[PDB]
Amino acid sequence: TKPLDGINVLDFTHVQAGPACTQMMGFLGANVIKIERRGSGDMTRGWLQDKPNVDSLYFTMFNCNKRSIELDMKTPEGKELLEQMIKKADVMVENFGPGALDRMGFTWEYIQELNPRVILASVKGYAEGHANEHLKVYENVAQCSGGAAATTGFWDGPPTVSGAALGSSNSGMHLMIGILAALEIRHKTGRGQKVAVAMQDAVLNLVRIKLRDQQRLERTGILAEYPQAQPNFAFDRDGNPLSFDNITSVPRGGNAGGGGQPGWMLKCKGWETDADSYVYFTIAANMWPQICDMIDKPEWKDDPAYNTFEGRVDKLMDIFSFIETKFADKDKFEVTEWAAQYGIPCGPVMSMKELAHDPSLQKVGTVVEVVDEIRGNHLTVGAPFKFSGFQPEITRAPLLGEHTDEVLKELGLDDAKIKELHAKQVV
Amino acid sequence: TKPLDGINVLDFTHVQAGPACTQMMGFLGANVIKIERRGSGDMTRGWLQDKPNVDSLYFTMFNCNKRSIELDMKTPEGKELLEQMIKKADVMVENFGPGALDRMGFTWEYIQELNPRVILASVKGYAEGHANEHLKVYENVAQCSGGAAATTGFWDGPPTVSGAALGSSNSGMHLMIGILAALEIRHKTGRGQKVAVAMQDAVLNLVRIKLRDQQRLERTGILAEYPQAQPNFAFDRDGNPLSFDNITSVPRGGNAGGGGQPGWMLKCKGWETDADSYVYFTIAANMWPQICDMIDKPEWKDDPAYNTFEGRVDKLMDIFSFIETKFADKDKFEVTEWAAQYGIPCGPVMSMKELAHDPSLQKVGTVVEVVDEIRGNHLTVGAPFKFSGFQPEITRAPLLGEHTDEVLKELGLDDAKIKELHAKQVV
Ligand SMILES: CC(C)(COP(=O)(O)OP(=O)(O)OC[C@H]1O[C@@H](n2cnc3c(N)ncnc32)[C@H](O)[C@@H]1OP(=O)(O)O)[C@@H](O)C(=O)NCCC(=O)NCCSO
Numbered sequence: 001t002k003p004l005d006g007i008n009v010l011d012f013t014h015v016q017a018g019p020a021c022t023q024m025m026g027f028l029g030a031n032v033i034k035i036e037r038r039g040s041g042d043m044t045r046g047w048l049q050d051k052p053n054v055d056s057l058y059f060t061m062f063n064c065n066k067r068s069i070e071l072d073m074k075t076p077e078g079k080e081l082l083e084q085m086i087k088k089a090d091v092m093v094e095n096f097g098p099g100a101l102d103r104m105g106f107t108w109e110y111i112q113e114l115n116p117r118v119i120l121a122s123v124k125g126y127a128e129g130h131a132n133e134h135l136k137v138y139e140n141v142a143q144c145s146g147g148a149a150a151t152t153g154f155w156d157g158p159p160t161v162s163g164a165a166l167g168s169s170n171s172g173m174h175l176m177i178g179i180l181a182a183l184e185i186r187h188k189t190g191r192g193q194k195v196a197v198a199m200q201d202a203v204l205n206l207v208r209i210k211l212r213d214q215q216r217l218e219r220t221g222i223l224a225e226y227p228q229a230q231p232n233f234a235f236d237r238d239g240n241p242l243s244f245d246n247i248t249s250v251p252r253g254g255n256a257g258g259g260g261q262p263g264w265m266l267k268c269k270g271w272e273t274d275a276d277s278y279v280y281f282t283i284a285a286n287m288w289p290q291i292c293d294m295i296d297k298p299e300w301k302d303d304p305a306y307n308t309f310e311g312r313v314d315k316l317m318d319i320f321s322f323i324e325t326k327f328a329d330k331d332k333f334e335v336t337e338w339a340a341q342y343g344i345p346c347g348p349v350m351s352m353k354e355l356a357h358d359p360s361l362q363k364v365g366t367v368v369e370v371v372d373e374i375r376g377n378h379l380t381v382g383a384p385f386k387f388s389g390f391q392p393e394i395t396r397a398p399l400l401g402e403h404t405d406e407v408l409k410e411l412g413l414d415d416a417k418i419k420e421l422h423a424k425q426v427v
Numbered sequence: 428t429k430p431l432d433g434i435n436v437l438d439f440t441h442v443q444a445g446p447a448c449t450q451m452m453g454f455l456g457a458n459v460i461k462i463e464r465r466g467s468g469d470m471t472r473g474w475l476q477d478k479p480n481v482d483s484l485y486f487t488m489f490n491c492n493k494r495s496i497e498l499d500m501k502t503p504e505g506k507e508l509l510e511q512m513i514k515k516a517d518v519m520v521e522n523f524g525p526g527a528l529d530r531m532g533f534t535w536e537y538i539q540e541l542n543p544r545v546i547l548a549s550v551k552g553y554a555e556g557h558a559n560e561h562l563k564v565y566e567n568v569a570q571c572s573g574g575a576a577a578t579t580g581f582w583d584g585p586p587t588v589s590g591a592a593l594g595s596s597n598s599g600m601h602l603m604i605g606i607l608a609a610l611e612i613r614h615k616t617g618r619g620q621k622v623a624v625a626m627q628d629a630v631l632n633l634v635r636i637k638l639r640d641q642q643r644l645e646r647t648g649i650l651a652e653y654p655q656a657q658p659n660f661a662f663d664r665d666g667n668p669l670s671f672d673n674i675t676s677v678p679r680g681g682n683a684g685g686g687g688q689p690g691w692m693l694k695c696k697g698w699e700t701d702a703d704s705y706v707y708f709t710i711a712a713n714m715w716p717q718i719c720d721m722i723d724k725p726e727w728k729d730d731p732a733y734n735t736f737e738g739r740v741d742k743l744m745d746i747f748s749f750i751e752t753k754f755a756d757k758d759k760f761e762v763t764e765w766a767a768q769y770g771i772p773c774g775p776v777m778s779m780k781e782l783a784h785d786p787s788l789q790k791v792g793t794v795v796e797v798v799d800e801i802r803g804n805h806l807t808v809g810a811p812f813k814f815s816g817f818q819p820e821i822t823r824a825p826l827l828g829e830h831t832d833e834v835l836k837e838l839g840l841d842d843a844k845i846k847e848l849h850a851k852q853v854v
């Protein structure tokens with residue numbers, strides 16, 4: 001049936017990294033109970049609201065398939081309720097500051113005593129043992145810490161953050177691997193473990209290819225697939241020439257190919273007024289005859305100045321600028337269809353508007369309309385992994401404290417005790 | 428212990444997306460057998476080599492903890508060997524182009540018949556059922572299809588690819604989630620499933636916050652925290668003011684926060700000569716009093732135009748221009764310290780040079796020195812999830828076909844048939 005049916009998750013998370021992890025677990029069938037601050041809740045509820053006093057799309061897109069209980073954990077009665085909840089949980093997830101759970105009385109040691117089967121999973125800024133262990137970090141600071149910012153953007157501009165959530169959502173997906181790995185250990189040992197993912201580390205994992213580059217640069221002095229290896233192409237803001245003679249750390253390479261074959265971002269019709277009217281166009285080394293046919297340069301097929309990767313190093317940017325002239329009168333999609341006829345990896349820059357209403361992504365369940373009769377329906381991203389014998393059923397995000405009484409009832413508390421906790425401001 | 432100890436992985440993968448998945452399963456204890464083409468093998472072997480006739484760092488950094496066998500699969504005797512290997516495998520992983528494995532005769536349907544416990548795990552460019560289902564896709568093509576390029580970069584520049592591998596390794600890590608979720612399904616049903624991750628979809632999942640923004644924009648006409656909603660700050664190509672008039676798709680926001688918590692990328696001493704001499708500075712609403720102390724401006728505490736997120740939406744870039752001047756004679760690390768005292772999320776742009784040789788990252792096993800006695804040692808990224816009861820043991824990447832006979836003997840074949848496979852040009 002569903003992979004995580006019958007898995008109970010005690011979810012202390014807030015913001016993005018932690019909640020992305022537990023939401024996706026929820027999508028795969030987990031029973032996720034979200035513990036929130038009494039009164040305000042997860043701060044995404046109030047961040048960037050489109051309607052005042054309605055939970056923001058920030059909250060709803062990260063907290064589907066979850067229930068909510070308000071709990072003040074700084075009270076002693078709040079701690080005893082947590083212990084009951086820990087004893088019934090298979091995994092606890094937290095992305096609080098570095099030592100916050102510990103300060104609350106719940107160290108890994110004490111959790112093991114309460115439930116020797118439970119898995120404790122956390123997101124942190126930096127790994128335990130790191131000099132910067134104790135630092136609070138959000139999305140973009142993590143991108144900077146893990147090498148993405150340094151290697152994203154242009155040689156003549158600043159380190160640039162990625163629009164993708166490399167620090168936070170990525171950390172949450174990384175933690176999901178850790179939790180699932182820990183569930184596989186537990187099948188063998190009958191015991192829970194602690195797993196942790198540092199945001200710096202989740203970022204650095206995606207930037208593996210740039211650590212390849214750093215070593216290539218140290219060993220050889222050149223990165224031949226980068227624009228700066230073309231003589232007299234790249235310049236700094238004062239017009240000084242940029243070459244690998246003077247580069248000792250992997251530079252920004254604009255829209256160069258990364259771990260793909262060489263490529264560039266080429267303008268299509270309307271690029272002046274439409275910010276997303278571009279394609280990415282790849283010059284794979286085994287496809288030069290095809291490219292030559294497409295752009296009507298038969299003379300470039302047998303010329304060694306043009307027909308190997310090595311021959312193209314000194315002129316690759318000129319070749320891209322010439323290919324680009326062939327797209328001046330065609331939109332993204334026509335250029336993509338044209339290239340497809342040749343088998344050339346090439347695709348449009350899809351705008352968020354285009355993605356939000358794309359039939360294909362709705363059909364395959366990647367962009368999903370959530371039914372929310374309280375707030376109005378909204379779109380979210382569903383499960384990016386598609387299975388032959390299981391479909392996710394995405395349900396709306398909880399109102400703050402919506403399930404508090406319902407959850408306290410599942411723990412076995414009589415109606416009178418639930419009454420008292422409301423009065424003492426515990427729940 | 429070792430999470431995937433005893434899990435047998437038949438690994439057809441090549442390039443980045445698939446190999447990152449299987450390598451990481453290998454780090455967690457899985458037994459990974461990499462099937463490669465005779466003669467050339469995985470295309471990363473020969474891709475941007477730093478030494479002639481030595482496996483490239485592209486290959487070594489993505490194929491540690493794996494054994495290698497060469498196989499001609501377009502041969503009848505090769506197809507028979509695969510059948511036998513499929514009978515002994517828990518998961519097959521593949522990232523050939525659309526229909527490639529099917530064309531070899533190994534459809535999901537036939538695979539089930541051969542071993543009803545096996546998991547088939549696949550990376551493609553686009554999801555099955557998508558209009559672009561049949562297209563071949565590298566790294567940056569997926570960044571473009573999944574919305575990242577459209578939303579990364581500056582408002583007066585092109586769509587920009589991330590240096591991080593959003594398309595390839597990111598898909599690989601999502602596929603790992605999918606595979607481990609199928610192993611959990613299998614504990615219940617006794618049966619294998621097919622799992623697939625589309626590169627477009629793995630990208631989209633990390634761009635969830637931008638689909639939030641797209642809906643905020645459709646509903647309200649504005650994104651108040653984006654540079655373009657700041658009065659007379661952003662300008663287009665021509666000397667011309669930008670605003671959310673006529674913006675209907677989420678625009679590029681340079682180095683803006685991307686969420687509920689504003690930030691920017693600020694220069695530090697050395698920025699003209701050092702591409703990575705910068706910090707990122709987040710302005711968390713709840714830490715606004717803490718910020719006013721370090722900035723040496725006590726006036727902003729009581730001012731209602733400066734003490735709330737709402738009051739700050741029209742002079743965000745004025746505050747950042749000012750905070751930047753107090754960094755002009757301190758390096759990255761000095762500025763990061765000068766904060767930190769105050770608990771401020773602010774950190775340095777780390778260069779690849781700094782990360783490759785950083786003591787902390789090597790202490791925690793995130794950057795790892797691989798002992799490779801054939802090729803010379805190299806660095807790699809280790810496991811980004813850290814466990815209380817388990818340490819990865821990373822071992823060197825295999826030579827092409829280094830383990831062919833070893834693997835052919837584990838299948839129960841004799842010495843003399845191993846010879847005739849060599850002579851018939853199948854192994
Ligand atoms: C997000 C953040 C950077 C900043 O968080 P913050 O605004 O400083 O809050 P915090 O540090 O998590 O929590 C403050 C305290 O309140 C407490 N708290 C949280 N929820 C509580 C509740 N319901 N009841 C009582 N106390 C609670 C915590 O115990 C914490 O401990 P201390 O007072 O002893 O320091 C930090 O939580 C963090 O570093 N998290 C890890 C990184 C991460 O996962 N970020 C993801 C999203 S990034 O875009």
Ligand SMILES: CC(C)(COP(=O)(O)OP(=O)(O)OC[C@H]1O[C@@H](n2cnc3c(N)ncnc32)[C@H](O)[C@@H]1OP(=O)(O)O)[C@@H](O)C(=O)NCCC(=O)NCCSO
Pocket residue numbers: 259260345441442443444445462463464465498499500501522523524525526527528530531550551552562563564565566594595
């Ligand atoms: C990456 C890539 C674009 C490369 O494309 P390509 O170089 O043209 O290779 P391919 O299309 O995968 O394989 C070519 C053929 O050789 C075959 N092949 C592969 N290994 C073989 C072997 N050992 N013996 C015989 N044939 C083999 C395939 O069956 C395929 O056969 P067809 O003629 O029936 O299509 C493509 O594999 C792809 O789209 N993969 C899926 C998406 C992906 O993961 N890309 C990420 C790469 S990381 O950026």
